Amino acid sequence: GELLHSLEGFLDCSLVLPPTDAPSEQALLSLVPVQRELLRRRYQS
């Protein structure tokens, strides 16, 4: 159960990036706060 809970927390802070027709390399830099907050959410309770 502890392993399953850790994996649920792992998936809760995983960032799914869906397909898009235009990879701009700049709209990808708009998800820097998202990744930062998802890490704070894994490192925190």
Alpha helix ranges (H) inside 1-45: 2-12, 32-43
Residue 39 binds to another protein (criterion: CB under 8 A): yes
Q: Which amino acid is at 41?
A: R
**Interface size with another protein, residues (CB under 8 A):** 7
- Could you give the CA distance from residue 18 to residue 3 in angstroms, rounded to a whole number? 27
The verdict on 44 binding another protein (CB under 8 A) reads yes
Q: Is 28 in the site for another protein (CB under 8 A)?
A: no
d(CA 10, CA 16): 12
| 40 contributes a contact to another protein by CB under 8 A | yes
Positions in the binding site for another protein (CB under 8 A): 14, 36, 39-40, 43-45
